[PDB]
RNA sequence: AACAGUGGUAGGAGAGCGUUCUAAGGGCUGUGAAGCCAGACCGGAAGGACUGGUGGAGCGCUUAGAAGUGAGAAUGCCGGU
RNA sequence: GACCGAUAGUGAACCAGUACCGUGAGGGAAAGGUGAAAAGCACCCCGGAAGGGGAGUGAAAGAGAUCCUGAAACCGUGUGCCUACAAGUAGUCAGAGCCCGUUAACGGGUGAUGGCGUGCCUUUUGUAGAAUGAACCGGCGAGUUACGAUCUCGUGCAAGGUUAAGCAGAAGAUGCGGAGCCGCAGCGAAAGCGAGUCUGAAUAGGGCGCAUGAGUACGUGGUCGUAGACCCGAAACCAGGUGA
RNA sequence: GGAACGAGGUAGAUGAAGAGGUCUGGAAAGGCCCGCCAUAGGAGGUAACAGCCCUGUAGUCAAAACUUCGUUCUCUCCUGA
């Protein structure tokens, strides 16, 4: 699909027809849902542990005899019912990640970045050169393109001026063309991208 | 994560305790006995809701019997005569109202006496 | 999607079944085990194959046969799946291998006929005679048996 | 709309209420947050309001997601009376 | 850190392996919070002092030294309605008289008198039981996780599905790695034959099979197996030490 | 066994921009109306919730003296068909 064309701040009338196979397919919500759930897990550590009944620093002898005196029969003073005993079951260290077949991943990324096109939430640029690494310049450029909320910025050449700037602005995020995944695309509203990165993205998949 | 949870227990018990106001002694103060009393009271209320319908008709019948005996009849003969004559579909409740405010009760009595022969 | 308007596919998730939490749900006091069947009795119960004490069916029937060390299994290819290579062409185990017709090449390739055949090709299979003597003629010759 | 049905233990199947944490977004509090205490409100239940007092700094909503997930009894453990 | 938040987390947030117990080896606790700042109550009165009532500081003194908030059992003071002829699992249904006025509703409190009515849990063929358990109040206290089987549902791809270790990448997503695994052909102990095979001179028969074609990767649920495996509860056995 | 260079460890240095006006309050970091800095919106304090109030952060620099590596030179060691 063709989607206009802009310059660092110039209207630069134009358009770039994008690979339909990549920017026109019908989205699968039932795939984006589990892609999101999988990606959100595997971000957690899972470093938690409780003391067992046998790990509590304590006693093995029994507090008193089983007959002669009227009292409930009791073994260790570190049983789950005593105050200061072990935790039955409870949190244990483990892993939370898992894997999906590759074609599902390809479908999910395609669907998300093709549904972005429907809502006119894609801006394609050219060049994107910064003379210096000032944060004022990036804010002026962003205002010049009517960007208010969060906004992803995708390049291809691993710019250092673009990465250094806009890394203090509390809404923007800069990534390489290879680093695109589902979460930041669906969590950033607007999506800036360079045509040079467009070619790489639509040539990998 | 760990879950503490105390306010839920306090609220759930205070509801029952507020429902058991007016009971004798410790039955309005301690949770365990108040709970049992509340459950028993529910059972009793159901049973007595049926029984009150059972017991109002008896009083109705007794008052009709007295008023009819004042006229020279019995309850059974009066009822047979009323059902036999002109199908008076008046129940017993309005019959008692007409008894306690009579001189209209008597007219129905002679209406039945006419057909009893 | 939007991260707040998130909804799963219908019928793919079920909620767990927590057991032993009150009497109004079923599984209330005894947790669905009744008054125990010796396995719901603390400890585990009985061994799976245990039949309460009886000469087991598995320990009764005799055990027969001996395994063979030099057992040779070939890769089976029927006539029908061979019918995708057009006319002419050469058929060799490697060519079948890097196409997906056969997934592995243990021992050798043994083509035996069960379906239909058209076109004319050349077949080079280990087998013993390139066919179970019913696809040799089906292949109308051209059967390199090596 | 018309007919039919609705006692229930062991047990099978279904639909729901509350708690803690996480993600989205959205919004509330020193002109008074949470907690606590009353009342003559609402819902078929599990529950949820509103108003007043106390308190003196926090807390909720919607849609998902995780679980140390709900107590009246174990001659249960600890504290107070 | 989708870990704890003072009965939790180390036995120990505090002069803790301390105090206590034991001849000894050894066992082993309880105990956090004034206020932003001591500005920590000069002076007067009662009292031997402790403790109060004023006056002052402070936003607060009901904040005044175990000094944030402060529930329940438990103990008291005042008051509206009942009670000294009555046989009661203590309530529920009917009902005068008296005292009040609400989240205004066929309202609130107390109740002379009439009818009905043998607590709760557990376990048994069967319990009001003279069968078991609990003095009361508050807190804590029991179906989990890992790895394998099997079934249903939702996906992805299908006669083809699917990479492991490893290498780059914020402890991430992902990219590349085709070793390996499960299916598409079966029968026989095997040599071996093949939609045919095995016994059988054969032909009749096979738990046979085709005819008559759906599996595979991942996810949520239901069961099973191995690990303490749902929570508590013995007498005994072995190994190393301490004591006339 | 020595002699020179380089990168570290054990202490530190420098480091941008609001007393903005106004309201309520015991006290503004809060509300409303306006501005600036950013390779620096990581944290903790201050009489309430602070990128511009304080200690700081991103970047740049640092060692008399002990130490950890690396490179080079010196320096030793006589054959294969």
PDB file of C-alpha atoms in Angstrom, chain A:
ATOM      1  CA  UNK A   1       0.000   0.000   0.000  1.00  0.00           C
ATOM      2  CA  UNK A   2       1.276   3.517  -0.862  1.00  0.00           C
ATOM      3  CA  UNK A   3       1.434   5.777   2.251  1.00  0.00           C
ATOM      4  CA  UNK A   4       2.700   9.302   1.278  1.00  0.00           C
ATOM      5  CA  UNK A   5       6.277  10.485   2.039  1.00  0.00           C
ATOM      6  CA  UNK A   6       7.840  13.187   4.283  1.00  0.00           C
ATOM      7  CA  UNK A   7      11.261  14.801   4.803  1.00  0.00           C
ATOM      8  CA  UNK A   8      13.067  15.708   8.059  1.00  0.00           C
ATOM      9  CA  UNK A   9      10.427  18.495   8.160  1.00  0.00           C
ATOM     10  CA  UNK A  10       9.466  18.864   4.476  1.00  0.00           C
ATOM     11  CA  UNK A  11       6.090  17.823   3.011  1.00  0.00           C
ATOM     12  CA  UNK A  12       8.125  16.427   0.061  1.00  0.00           C
ATOM     13  CA  UNK A  13       5.018  15.213  -1.803  1.00  0.00           C
ATOM     14  CA  UNK A  14       5.382  11.550  -2.859  1.00  0.00           C
ATOM     15  CA  UNK A  15       4.338   7.976  -1.953  1.00  0.00           C
ATOM     16  CA  UNK A  16       5.859   4.493  -1.496  1.00  0.00           C
ATOM     17  CA  UNK A  17       3.738   1.416  -2.411  1.00  0.00           C
ATOM     18  CA  UNK A  18       4.623  -1.176   0.296  1.00  0.00           C
ATOM     19  CA  UNK A  19       4.733  -4.995  -0.217  1.00  0.00           C
ATOM     20  CA  UNK A  20       1.059  -6.026   0.160  1.00  0.00           C
ATOM     21  CA  UNK A  21       2.179  -9.489   1.280  1.00  0.00           C
ATOM     22  CA  UNK A  22       3.678  -7.684   4.281  1.00  0.00           C
ATOM     23  CA  UNK A  23       1.485  -4.575   4.739  1.00  0.00           C
ATOM     24  CA  UNK A  24      -1.912  -5.723   3.495  1.00  0.00           C
ATOM     25  CA  UNK A  25      -2.696  -9.157   4.905  1.00  0.00           C
ATOM     26  CA  UNK A  26      -5.733  -9.683   7.105  1.00  0.00           C
ATOM     27  CA  UNK A  27      -4.715  -9.569  10.793  1.00  0.00           C
ATOM     28  CA  UNK A  28      -5.138 -12.574  13.087  1.00  0.00           C
ATOM     29  CA  UNK A  29      -6.078 -11.411  16.572  1.00  0.00           C
ATOM     30  CA  UNK A  30      -6.034 -14.979  17.883  1.00  0.00           C
ATOM     31  CA  UNK A  31      -2.315 -15.041  17.033  1.00  0.00           C
ATOM     32  CA  UNK A  32      -1.401 -11.592  18.329  1.00  0.00           C
ATOM     33  CA  UNK A  33      -2.972 -12.466  21.685  1.00  0.00           C
ATOM     34  CA  UNK A  34      -0.727 -15.439  22.411  1.00  0.00           C
ATOM     35  CA  UNK A  35       2.270 -13.671  20.893  1.00  0.00           C
ATOM     36  CA  UNK A  36       1.739 -10.877  23.434  1.00  0.00           C
ATOM     37  CA  UNK A  37       1.296 -13.338  26.293  1.00  0.00           C
ATOM     38  CA  UNK A  38       4.440 -15.260  25.361  1.00  0.00           C
ATOM     39  CA  UNK A  39       6.531 -12.116  25.000  1.00  0.00           C
ATOM     40  CA  UNK A  40       5.323 -10.680  28.314  1.00  0.00           C
ATOM     41  CA  UNK A  41       6.327 -13.839  30.101  1.00  0.00           C
ATOM     42  CA  UNK A  42      10.040 -14.662  29.810  1.00  0.00           C
ATOM     43  CA  UNK A  43      10.598 -11.084  31.004  1.00  0.00           C
ATOM     44  CA  UNK A  44      10.225 -12.255  34.614  1.00  0.00           C
ATOM     45  CA  UNK A  45      13.001 -13.551  36.846  1.00  0.00           C
ATOM     46  CA  UNK A  46      11.192 -15.954  39.149  1.00  0.00           C
ATOM     47  CA  UNK A  47      13.720 -15.710  41.970  1.00  0.00           C
ATOM     48  CA  UNK A  48      11.565 -16.672  44.973  1.00  0.00           C
ATOM     49  CA  UNK A  49      11.837 -19.460  47.605  1.00  0.00           C
ATOM     50  CA  UNK A  50      10.358 -20.446  51.023  1.00  0.00           C
ATOM     51  CA  UNK A  51      11.833 -22.675  53.759  1.00  0.00           C
ATOM     52  CA  UNK A  52      10.631 -26.271  53.710  1.00  0.00           C
ATOM     53  CA  UNK A  53       9.633 -28.147  56.843  1.00  0.00           C
ATOM     54  CA  UNK A  54      13.029 -29.885  56.797  1.00  0.00           C
ATOM     55  CA  UNK A  55      15.081 -26.767  55.997  1.00  0.00           C
ATOM     56  CA  UNK A  56      14.047 -24.666  58.996  1.00  0.00           C
ATOM     57  CA  UNK A  57      16.817 -24.360  61.563  1.00  0.00           C
ATOM     58  CA  UNK A  58      15.288 -26.335  64.358  1.00  0.00           C
ATOM     59  CA  UNK A  59      14.718 -29.568  66.189  1.00  0.00           C
ATOM     60  CA  UNK A  60      14.342 -33.239  65.412  1.00  0.00           C
ATOM     61  CA  UNK A  61      13.544 -34.474  68.897  1.00  0.00           C
ATOM     62  CA  UNK A  62       9.976 -34.583  69.966  1.00  0.00           C
ATOM     63  CA  UNK A  63       8.740 -32.076  72.557  1.00  0.00           C
ATOM     64  CA  UNK A  64       6.999 -34.605  74.833  1.00  0.00           C
ATOM     65  CA  UNK A  65       5.732 -38.166  75.164  1.00  0.00           C
ATOM     66  CA  UNK A  66       2.680 -39.582  73.403  1.00  0.00           C
ATOM     67  CA  UNK A  67       0.877 -40.839  76.528  1.00  0.00           C
ATOM     68  CA  UNK A  68       0.447 -40.086  80.207  1.00  0.00           C
ATOM     69  CA  UNK A  69      -0.261 -36.381  79.806  1.00  0.00           C
ATOM     70  CA  UNK A  70      -3.314 -34.920  78.130  1.00  0.00           C
ATOM     71  CA  UNK A  71      -2.086 -33.079  75.040  1.00  0.00           C
ATOM     72  CA  UNK A  72      -2.319 -33.442  71.228  1.00  0.00           C
ATOM     73  CA  UNK A  73       0.410 -35.834  69.967  1.00  0.00           C
ATOM     74  CA  UNK A  74       3.149 -33.617  68.436  1.00  0.00           C
ATOM     75  CA  UNK A  75       6.487 -34.355  66.720  1.00  0.00           C
ATOM     76  CA  UNK A  76       8.914 -31.585  65.638  1.00  0.00           C
ATOM     77  CA  UNK A  77       8.258 -28.031  66.965  1.00  0.00           C
ATOM     78  CA  UNK A  78       8.811 -27.008  63.300  1.00  0.00           C
ATOM     79  CA  UNK A  79       5.657 -28.641  61.833  1.00  0.00           C
ATOM     80  CA  UNK A  80       3.383 -26.519  59.501  1.00  0.00           C
ATOM     81  CA  UNK A  81       0.802 -25.936  62.335  1.00  0.00           C
ATOM     82  CA  UNK A  82       3.269 -24.536  64.963  1.00  0.00           C
ATOM     83  CA  UNK A  83       4.141 -20.810  65.088  1.00  0.00           C
ATOM     84  CA  UNK A  84       7.514 -20.702  63.285  1.00  0.00           C
ATOM     85  CA  UNK A  85       7.221 -23.999  61.356  1.00  0.00           C
ATOM     86  CA  UNK A  86       7.806 -24.748  57.658  1.00  0.00           C
ATOM     87  CA  UNK A  87       5.644 -23.592  54.699  1.00  0.00           C
ATOM     88  CA  UNK A  88       3.754 -26.525  53.054  1.00  0.00           C
ATOM     89  CA  UNK A  89       4.168 -26.129  49.233  1.00  0.00           C
ATOM     90  CA  UNK A  90       4.606 -22.378  48.518  1.00  0.00           C
ATOM     91  CA  UNK A  91       6.727 -20.434  45.903  1.00  0.00           C
ATOM     92  CA  UNK A  92       9.684 -22.347  44.382  1.00  0.00           C
ATOM     93  CA  UNK A  93      12.401 -21.137  41.886  1.00  0.00           C
ATOM     94  CA  UNK A  94      11.534 -22.053  38.273  1.00  0.00           C
ATOM     95  CA  UNK A  95      11.309 -20.799  34.691  1.00  0.00           C
ATOM     96  CA  UNK A  96       8.320 -19.382  32.838  1.00  0.00           C
ATOM     97  CA  UNK A  97       9.311 -19.212  29.159  1.00  0.00           C
ATOM     98  CA  UNK A  98       8.275 -21.353  26.199  1.00  0.00           C
ATOM     99  CA  UNK A  99       8.441 -21.389  22.413  1.00  0.00           C
ATOM    100  CA  UNK A 100       6.175 -21.109  19.354  1.00  0.00           C
ATOM    101  CA  UNK A 101       6.578 -22.462  15.806  1.00  0.00           C
ATOM    102  CA  UNK A 102       8.291 -20.028  13.460  1.00  0.00           C
ATOM    103  CA  UNK A 103       5.437 -19.504  10.993  1.00  0.00           C
ATOM    104  CA  UNK A 104       3.223 -18.355  13.868  1.00  0.00           C
ATOM    105  CA  UNK A 105       5.827 -15.720  14.741  1.00  0.00           C
ATOM    106  CA  UNK A 106       5.992 -14.558  11.107  1.00  0.00           C
ATOM    107  CA  UNK A 107       2.194 -14.298  10.939  1.00  0.00           C
ATOM    108  CA  UNK A 108       2.019 -12.365  14.214  1.00  0.00           C
ATOM    109  CA  UNK A 109       4.582  -9.724  13.283  1.00  0.00           C
ATOM    110  CA  UNK A 110       3.064  -9.321   9.812  1.00  0.00           C
ATOM    111  CA  UNK A 111      -0.434  -8.952  11.244  1.00  0.00           C
ATOM    112  CA  UNK A 112       0.545  -6.332  13.807  1.00  0.00           C
ATOM    113  CA  UNK A 113       2.517  -4.143  11.437  1.00  0.00           C
ATOM    114  CA  UNK A 114      -0.163  -4.479   8.755  1.00  0.00           C
ATOM    115  CA  UNK A 115      -2.948  -3.500  11.147  1.00  0.00           C
ATOM    116  CA  UNK A 116      -0.876  -0.431  11.980  1.00  0.00           C
ATOM    117  CA  UNK A 117      -1.370   0.667   8.355  1.00  0.00           C
ATOM    118  CA  UNK A 118      -5.178   0.648   8.552  1.00  0.00           C
ATOM    119  CA  UNK A 119      -5.319   3.377  11.215  1.00  0.00           C
ATOM    120  CA  UNK A 120      -2.915   5.700   9.342  1.00  0.00           C
ATOM    121  CA  UNK A 121      -0.403   5.298  12.179  1.00  0.00           C
ATOM    122  CA  UNK A 122       2.666   4.854   9.950  1.00  0.00           C
ATOM    123  CA  UNK A 123       4.973   7.673   8.877  1.00  0.00           C
ATOM    124  CA  UNK A 124       7.766   6.910   6.408  1.00  0.00           C
ATOM    125  CA  UNK A 125      10.701   9.315   6.159  1.00  0.00           C
ATOM    126  CA  UNK A 126      13.949   9.662   4.227  1.00  0.00           C
ATOM    127  CA  UNK A 127      17.573  10.152   5.312  1.00  0.00           C
ATOM    128  CA  UNK A 128      16.954  11.301   8.926  1.00  0.00           C
ATOM    129  CA  UNK A 129      20.282  13.029   9.539  1.00  0.00           C
ATOM    130  CA  UNK A 130      21.207  14.888  12.732  1.00  0.00           C
ATOM    131  CA  UNK A 131      24.146  17.288  12.674  1.00  0.00           C
ATOM    132  CA  UNK A 132      24.513  17.201  16.478  1.00  0.00           C
ATOM    133  CA  UNK A 133      23.167  15.196  19.414  1.00  0.00           C
ATOM    134  CA  UNK A 134      21.048  17.960  20.956  1.00  0.00           C
ATOM    135  CA  UNK A 135      17.736  17.020  22.555  1.00  0.00           C
ATOM    136  CA  UNK A 136      16.192  20.322  21.429  1.00  0.00           C
ATOM    137  CA  UNK A 137      16.472  19.372  17.759  1.00  0.00           C
ATOM    138  CA  UNK A 138      14.674  16.052  18.178  1.00  0.00           C
ATOM    139  CA  UNK A 139      11.827  17.689  20.086  1.00  0.00           C
ATOM    140  CA  UNK A 140      11.458  20.330  17.372  1.00  0.00           C
ATOM    141  CA  UNK A 141      11.410  17.639  14.675  1.00  0.00           C
ATOM    142  CA  UNK A 142       8.834  15.573  16.574  1.00  0.00           C
ATOM    143  CA  UNK A 143       6.607  18.614  17.025  1.00  0.00           C
ATOM    144  CA  UNK A 144       6.968  19.360  13.315  1.00  0.00           C
ATOM    145  CA  UNK A 145       5.335  16.011  12.498  1.00  0.00           C
ATOM    146  CA  UNK A 146       2.426  16.257  14.989  1.00  0.00           C
ATOM    147  CA  UNK A 147       3.636  13.539  17.348  1.00  0.00           C
ATOM    148  CA  UNK A 148       2.296  13.801  20.897  1.00  0.00           C
ATOM    149  CA  UNK A 149       2.163  10.398  22.580  1.00  0.00           C
ATOM    150  CA  UNK A 150       4.741   7.602  22.421  1.00  0.00           C
ATOM    151  CA  UNK A 151       6.449   6.955  19.090  1.00  0.00           C
ATOM    152  CA  UNK A 152       8.801   4.227  17.893  1.00  0.00           C
ATOM    153  CA  UNK A 153      11.649   5.226  15.582  1.00  0.00           C
ATOM    154  CA  UNK A 154      13.069   2.529  13.303  1.00  0.00           C
ATOM    155  CA  UNK A 155      16.274   3.085  11.336  1.00  0.00           C
ATOM    156  CA  UNK A 156      18.727   0.724   9.645  1.00  0.00           C
ATOM    157  CA  UNK A 157      22.263   2.135   9.947  1.00  0.00           C
ATOM    158  CA  UNK A 158      22.583   2.201  13.770  1.00  0.00           C
ATOM    159  CA  UNK A 159      22.736   5.971  14.054  1.00  0.00           C
ATOM    160  CA  UNK A 160      24.496   7.325  17.127  1.00  0.00           C
ATOM    161  CA  UNK A 161      23.126  10.867  16.972  1.00  0.00           C
ATOM    162  CA  UNK A 162      19.535   9.619  16.802  1.00  0.00           C
ATOM    163  CA  UNK A 163      20.203   7.152  19.607  1.00  0.00           C
ATOM    164  CA  UNK A 164      21.888   9.745  21.834  1.00  0.00           C
ATOM    165  CA  UNK A 165      19.131  12.276  21.315  1.00  0.00           C
ATOM    166  CA  UNK A 166      15.564  11.256  22.142  1.00  0.00           C
ATOM    167  CA  UNK A 167      16.881   8.858  24.765  1.00  0.00           C
ATOM    168  CA  UNK A 168      15.988  11.381  27.476  1.00  0.00           C
ATOM    169  CA  UNK A 169      12.548  12.288  26.095  1.00  0.00           C
ATOM    170  CA  UNK A 170      10.134  10.291  28.284  1.00  0.00           C
ATOM    171  CA  UNK A 171       8.061   8.836  25.442  1.00  0.00           C
ATOM    172  CA  UNK A 172      10.231   7.973  22.454  1.00  0.00           C
ATOM    173  CA  UNK A 173      12.147   4.762  21.758  1.00  0.00           C
ATOM    174  CA  UNK A 174      14.822   4.148  19.111  1.00  0.00           C
ATOM    175  CA  UNK A 175      15.508   0.681  17.695  1.00  0.00           C
ATOM    176  CA  UNK A 176      17.363  -0.971  14.827  1.00  0.00           C
ATOM    177  CA  UNK A 177      15.581  -2.546  11.872  1.00  0.00           C
ATOM    178  CA  UNK A 178      16.383  -6.031  13.185  1.00  0.00           C
ATOM    179  CA  UNK A 179      15.057  -5.339  16.673  1.00  0.00           C
ATOM    180  CA  UNK A 180      11.368  -4.883  15.889  1.00  0.00           C
ATOM    181  CA  UNK A 181       9.014  -7.147  17.813  1.00  0.00           C
ATOM    182  CA  UNK A 182       5.356  -7.168  18.749  1.00  0.00           C
ATOM    183  CA  UNK A 183       5.312  -5.428  22.132  1.00  0.00           C
ATOM    184  CA  UNK A 184       6.921  -2.109  21.249  1.00  0.00           C
ATOM    185  CA  UNK A 185       5.006  -1.903  17.962  1.00  0.00           C
ATOM    186  CA  UNK A 186       1.636  -2.344  19.674  1.00  0.00           C
ATOM    187  CA  UNK A 187       2.664  -0.236  22.687  1.00  0.00           C
ATOM    188  CA  UNK A 188       3.773   2.943  20.925  1.00  0.00           C
ATOM    189  CA  UNK A 189       0.854   4.277  18.833  1.00  0.00           C
ATOM    190  CA  UNK A 190       2.763   6.174  16.135  1.00  0.00           C
ATOM    191  CA  UNK A 191       5.498   4.342  14.210  1.00  0.00           C
ATOM    192  CA  UNK A 192       8.241   6.272  12.452  1.00  0.00           C
ATOM    193  CA  UNK A 193      10.411   4.374   9.992  1.00  0.00           C
ATOM    194  CA  UNK A 194      12.903   5.093   7.224  1.00  0.00           C
ATOM    195  CA  UNK A 195      12.559   3.772   3.685  1.00  0.00           C
ATOM    196  CA  UNK A 196      16.028   2.240   3.972  1.00  0.00           C
ATOM    197  CA  UNK A 197      14.705   0.286   6.949  1.00  0.00           C
ATOM    198  CA  UNK A 198      11.489  -0.479   5.048  1.00  0.00           C
ATOM    199  CA  UNK A 199      13.489  -2.363   2.436  1.00  0.00           C
ATOM    200  CA  UNK A 200      15.256  -4.474   5.067  1.00  0.00           C
ATOM    201  CA  UNK A 201      12.039  -5.214   6.947  1.00  0.00           C
ATOM    202  CA  UNK A 202      10.150  -6.314   3.850  1.00  0.00           C
ATOM    203  CA  UNK A 203      13.150  -8.248   2.529  1.00  0.00           C
ATOM    204  CA  UNK A 204      13.757 -10.371   5.626  1.00  0.00           C
ATOM    205  CA  UNK A 205      10.157 -11.611   5.711  1.00  0.00           C
TER     206      UNK A 205
END
